[PDB]
Ligand binder design. Structure first.
Ligand SMILES: *Cc1c(COP(=O)(O)O)cnc(C)c1O
Ligand SMILES: *Cc1c(COP(=O)(O)O)cnc(C)c1O
Ligand SMILES: NC(=O)[C@]1(O)O[C@H](CO)[C@@H](O)[C@H](O)[C@H]1O
Ligand SMILES: NC(=O)[C@]1(O)O[C@H](CO)[C@@H](O)[C@H](O)[C@H]1O
Lengths: 810, 810
């Protein structure tokens, strides 16, 4: 047992054991003779869950009594992952449960692997919401996460013949012990219908009704006895719905399809009606819940003083016109008063600048699905533009540029413009991203209302991303500076005074080696893949995207392969290059990239001359639980997006906290990471944002690089000739064609510097002692990237509430 | 507290209270300040449930150790109703829980009304299966009920403008505390595909797979510590199902529709594909489960010695060809051996003789959905007919009459013929019904294999239908003869020696009066309907059907009304005529009958001259929980089906056990009831089966009765002229037309005798003392109708197992 895992008290271990057996008997209705590992997992889960409800009930009662300002985080995604270990960590129960299960003759680690990941997210955006919930609870904020309880989360990825195959993520199959259905708080949501203008107000009538049933999941703070709530809505058809009798009952599945599945798109907008329904569904149910709670604390003047609503991207943007609809149509406030309240309550966070990801809903869709909201949006636009016209008289082009309504083939509503107009604060997620927002995409808005624009650099929770996934590292750190850093990561700076400590250097290197052996074993366990634990673990895990440039990584791998084949008996630092991530089902190029990666591995991993000097592994079904395993085992973190495309990135922060060195472009948070650790302790390369703009001004021509770089030319010709696809010589023609003629992310432009930088990485790896000292310099300066710092800034600069580290009673 | 309700021990009441609070806190995650009546109901349910799991686990372990012959009751319907009170009764916990909840400041009766009825049945057939499960557990048989877990049971009936409106029975909305999902025992079921004939056997290939997930519900025996299992299958699509990505996920609801809703037909066959899928789904999953259990006890010679499968009607008839398919195609037994095993294992129970209820599946449907089964059915038919031909040489018409395959417009498979051929026993559900089977419908089969035909008169469980719904009566009875009768209803005969006991007579009459006041109050509570508790409660509750003749009851009611209007100041015994029951959604005539009943009430209940002398009430949403309330309050039980149409009936037995006198035809079980109590203690009238046949031979002409009976003529003319439907004068034209020209059930033929018999009923009611003495004579002789007697006969005469009243350890 390690210190950071808590105490294994005699009384508690005894108590845990009896409750474990109690649940196995009464809850699972099983006996030790027929119980399976899954049964044991559930018995443990219910036992740990019991320890939360006491605190959960008290916390909520506490908020009712003190009535503090409530924070509502709206998101269509919450990538929670597993809950068992996280709960034990935050309740200081890990060692006791480990001991208790040990005494029952069970291996707790084995039981933990049985829990299904709660994959209600695509990647970074969804995981950020999850980290935020953890930090808000740890900082004592009266916060509530509101989303959708999808029956099916992000698909499970299978690799067949080197191609990605998707399969349903039936995560609720065996039940979810952490959630508590609250059918008593079901609320009605309206769709379609028409607007009636009467004597005293517009009325939205003849609507189709869909019920929203809430399910609550506890969110425990770190050892402070605070347990907040994440409420996810599930769609239910009313009982007189459609009420052939049989057909009417079967058609209920039509209204319930709203919460059936998560759209698997990352940084890509797909204007489908079902998606719009999901967005309104979450917003309508949530706002009714917010108002109800507010009325049970009626002059909405104090509404902004008791309520804060944070819009995670534009997905829940309809909250703005919905709040107006309720205040004007139902509460009967005058427009101006309602608008004042709405703006002071809402804040919007932008997460990307890529055009294909921006939400622009066709007017005809909103017109049919939400007629009243469209009218309100037009009125908002009308008044907003009048303000622009008054500030910039005669600037007619500005008017059309800032309009919430876009004219063209089909009229569309720019949801981002709607959010800026209706929020009192708009923030980016990394310093460089926030600056780009003010200088380009939202330049006109910044000039009109400069005070609204802010920055809030992303972060990750050190509980799940250090203590939970890397106890070995958390322990050697605690041995030197104590445990206080777990909720005050800035304290990691104290490790700087150990950079020359021969004992620490040895331990840091030891933990990393153990993590790699552990991972190298898991790889053969559940995926039969031998690898060499002595090689440098080169890892790039994140969603497959052209802007993330997994292709640039591929070009490097092929370069290393060709160089070995050219001079076989020359020494090179051994490497295991691991690439993993899911591709959106309809993203063809992304799916082709996965096939390319596996095709490269097929050639490289079976070439006798190469040996164990270079391996290429594609990490199947990358997800939160997998990240917790591979990140602690990484040596090199690949963060190579084209400058100006990755708003922030968060995987980069995870690797930095876990002892990996970073090779990357000056993009998103990478800039601040290098700034914190010192550029000499980072492997930076490639074009900066300004270099990219210069290339665009003069026109990017890939042919130029192909003509001037012999090694690059050889690679393209290998791909084109079928070297990596014998049976299908022209298999990768689309890839080559894109790279040569229409590459929006300029892979070739950064190739030379990337390869040269990779050489400097291999050089440092040859000097174990100095590699580790640089690692220590990274870990020691990763404090700024804790989501506790991020949330504290949102709290003080946007929500108007003070964070607290005070423990609530037991 | 009453004696039959158990002891309220000091220790147990204390224990119950703490566990109640424990579940309210840890299970429901609530505190006394926010808990609602529903929360309290669930806290109590989980507390009582806890007391079962100990016994449930032991019982099943016991069967594994002793390995007795297992009884499998297959049914597509199980009308269970509520479970809380029944569980308390069988565990002797009623008074303790009443006390415990009382001490917690809660009214247990109020909490019981919160439980949703488990309505997985249409009426008699489904309720019989439920009573049987109770008796099998009470008699210590190793029995298992197998069915489908419908998401939506029988629809909830709403009456609007006097018309029936149907609404979805979302019974699982708030969760089901009694069931335990067993996802670990999920089994695959195959559909469609094609048959491949290879070297060594036929193979069913290219099939569509649907998963069957089981949910187990405990079935406690009466105070014997036995807890059997009812396993219901739920449909689940495999995870690579259909695997547009989004559309593929949404289409999963197509395979899952199999267990979505119960077909609401009573005594009516509707050849829909979805229905056929449900029938095979339950059969395929169940048989795999049966075999697995059998292999874990391989020469299927002993299969019939360890397994008995009872087919509840022909709904699960595919069990016969499915068992053959498994034994021949998978286990590789020779046909003859497999057939021997199948026949010795299967037994079939017929529940009706009406032609429209008989299952005749179109060959083209089976051909596409279950190609292999169709081939097996043809082979069975081939060999069966060869046997007929050998026994009756030259009788070619017999061959075509007995064939399992019916020729005509579209070829069909007679499922009843399939069942007789493949079962070693075939039984009817009442003496007269079983005789009719041998003399008419199955005459040819009886002549070929006389030994197969038996009778097993239906019964009802005295636990739910006496102790639970009428504790007042159960108590005064126990006061005289003890409690032993609750599991040995024949002992009620001892009450015959009290027929002249002035104290008993007074108590019997007292309990009935209390029940009527209780019901008269409930009527105003949840349905705002005042009624007179002093009047005779005339009740007919059962599904709306032409053969059940609610129309004959209507004719009587109108007759009473007209007679009062003719001589207003003449005395008549006051009556409250109550009629209730659901009509199948697509049964037009049944829906018109409901409208007629409410229309009559509209006129009668508002006629000043009538006063409180006659009321006509339509009991809305008749279901099990409602039956438990109205039956104990009834004085007169209406069982007036046309002779030869009601196979048995069970509502008739419920009324007899609860102190109501019976007015009815010599049909179904009525015959045996009159025989047991003595015809002088029953109000019998109308044609006997032989009279009906005579009328058919000479041709039924309704006009004759209309021309000869003045009172009847007046009624038809009132209906025709719009007397009961002012705004819609011809509203009941279809009813009059049917009655006059195409009435298959001869309502008019029994009108005169029915009215005269009703007069004799009113005469006896005027003499309270003698009315009660006859009641005592009925209750005292109702013993034969306990389902314990029925199950004991099935056990000894069909299944080959001995029942047991031995208590299992605590
Ligand atoms: C942290 C995380 C991400 C985000 O990674 P980036 O490299 O910033 O894109 C995506 N997926 C999972 C499962 C994560 O844990
Ligand atoms: C007993 C019962 C029946 C069967 O009644 P019959 O009069 O035999 O048709 C039908 N429905 C319910 C709810 C029952 O309890
Ligand atoms: N918009 C997104 O989906 C994204 O994943 O969001 C993350 C969190 O802000 C960012 O870290 C990331 O850069 C961005 O791509
Ligand atoms: N076949 C049926 O559905 C029916 O309800 O079954 C009951 C039980 O045998 C019988 O009591 C009843 O007579 C019959 O109509």
């Amino acid at each position: 047992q390690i210190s950071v895992r808590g105490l294994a008290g005699v009384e508690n271990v005894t108590e845990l054991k009896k409750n474990f057996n109690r649940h196995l008997h009464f809850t699972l209705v099983k006996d030790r003779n027929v119980a399976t590992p899954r049964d044991y997992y559930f018995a443990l889960a219910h036992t740990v869950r019991d320890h939360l409800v006491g605190r959960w009930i008290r916390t909520q009662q506490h908020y009712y009594e003190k009535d503090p300002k409530r924070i509502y985080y709206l998101s269509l995604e919450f990538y929670m992952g597993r809950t068992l270990q996280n709960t034990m960590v935050n309740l200081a129960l890990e060692n006791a449960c480990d001991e208790a299960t040990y005494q029952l003759g069970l291996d707790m680690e084995e039981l933990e692997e049985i829990e299904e990941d709660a994959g209600l997210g695509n990647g970074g955006l969804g995981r950020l919401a999850a980290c935020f919930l953890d930090s808000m609870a740890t900082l004592g904020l009266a916060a509530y996460g509101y989303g959708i309880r999808y029956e099916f989360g992000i698909f499970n990825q299978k690799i067949c013949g080197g191609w990605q195959m998707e399969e349903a993520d039936d995560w609720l199959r065996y039940g979810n012990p952490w959630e508590k259905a609250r059918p008593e708080f079901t609320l009605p949501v309206h769709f379609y219908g028409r607007v009636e203008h009467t004597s005293q107000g517009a009325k939205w009538v003849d609507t189709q009704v869909v019920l929203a049933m809430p399910y609550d999941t506890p969110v425990p703070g770190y050892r402070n006895n605070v347990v907040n709530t994440m409420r996810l809505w599930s769609a239910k058809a009313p009982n007189d719905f459609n009420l052939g009798y049989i057909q009417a009952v079967l058609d209920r599945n039509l209204a319930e399809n709203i919460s059936r599945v998560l759209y698997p798109n990352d940084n890509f907008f797909e204007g489908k009606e079902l998606r719009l329904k999901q967005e309104y569904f979450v917003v309508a149910a949530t706002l009714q819940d917010i108002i109800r709670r507010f009325k049970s604390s009626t002059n909405f003047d104090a509404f902004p003083d008791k309520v804060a609503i944070q819009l995670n991207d534009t997905h829940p943007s309809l909250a703005i016109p919905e709040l107006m609809r309720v205040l004007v149509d139902l509460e009967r406030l005058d427009w101006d008063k309602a608008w004042e309240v709405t703006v002071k309550t809402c804040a919007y966070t932008n997460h990307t600048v890529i055009p294909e990801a921006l939400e622009r809903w066709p007017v005809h869709l909103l017109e049919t699905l939400l007629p009243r909201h469209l009218q309100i949006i037009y009125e908002i636009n009308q008044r907003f533009l009048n303000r622009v016209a008054a500030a910039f008289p005669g600037d007619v082009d500005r008017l059309r540029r800032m309009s919430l309504v876009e004219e063209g083939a089909v009229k569309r509503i720019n949801m981002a413009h709607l959010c800026i107009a209706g929020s009192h604060a708009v923030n980016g997620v990394a310093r460089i991203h926030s600056e780009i927002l003010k200088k380009t995409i939202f330049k006109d808005f910044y000039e009109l209302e400069p005070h609204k624009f802010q920055n809030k650099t992303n972060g990750i929770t050190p509980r799940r991303w250090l203590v939970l996934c890397n106890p070995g590292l958390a322990e050697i750190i605690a041995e030197r500076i104590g445990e206080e850093y777990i909720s005050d990561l800035d304290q990691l700076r104290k490790l700087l005074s150990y950079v020359d400590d021969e004992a620490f250097i040895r331990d840091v290197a030891k933990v990393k080696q153990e993590n790699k052996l552990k991972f190298a074993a898991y790889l053969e366990r559940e995926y039969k893949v031998h690898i060499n634990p002595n090689s440098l673990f080169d890892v790039q895990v994140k969603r497959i995207h052209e802007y993330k440039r997994q292709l640039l990584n591929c070009l490097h791998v092929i370069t290393l392969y060709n160089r070995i084949k050219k001079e076989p008996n020359k020494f090179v630092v051994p490497r295991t290059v691991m690439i993993g991530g899911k591709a959106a089902p309809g993203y063809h190029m992304a799916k082709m990239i996965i096939k390319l990666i596996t095709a490269i591995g097929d050639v490289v991993n079976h070439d006798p001359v190469v040996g164990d000097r270079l391996r290429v592994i594609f990490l199947e079904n990358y997800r939160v639980s997998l990240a917790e395993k591979v990140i602690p085992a990484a040596d090199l973190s690949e963060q190579i997006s084209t400058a100006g495309t990755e708003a922030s990135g968060t995987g980069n922060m995870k690797f930095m906290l876990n002892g990996a060195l970073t090779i990357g472009t000056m993009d998103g948070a990478n800039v601040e990471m290098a700034e914190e650790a010192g550029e000499e302790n980072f492997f930076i390369f490639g074009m900066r944002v300004e270099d990219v703009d210069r290339l665009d001004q003069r026109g990017y021509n890939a042919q130029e690089y192909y003509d001037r770089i012999p090694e690059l030319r050889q690679i393209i010709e290998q791909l084109s000739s079928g070297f990596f696809s014998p049976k299908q010589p022209d298999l990768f023609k689309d890839i080559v064609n894109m790279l040569m003629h229409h590459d929006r992310f300029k892979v070739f432009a950064d190739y030379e510097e990337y390869v040269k930088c990779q050489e400097r990485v291999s050089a440092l790896y040859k000097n174990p002692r100095e590699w580790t000292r640089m690692v220590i310099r990274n870990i020691a300066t990763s404090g700024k990237f804790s989501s506790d710092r991020t949330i504290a800034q949102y709290a003080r600069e946007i929500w108007g509430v003070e964070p607290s580290r005070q423990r609530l009673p037991a």
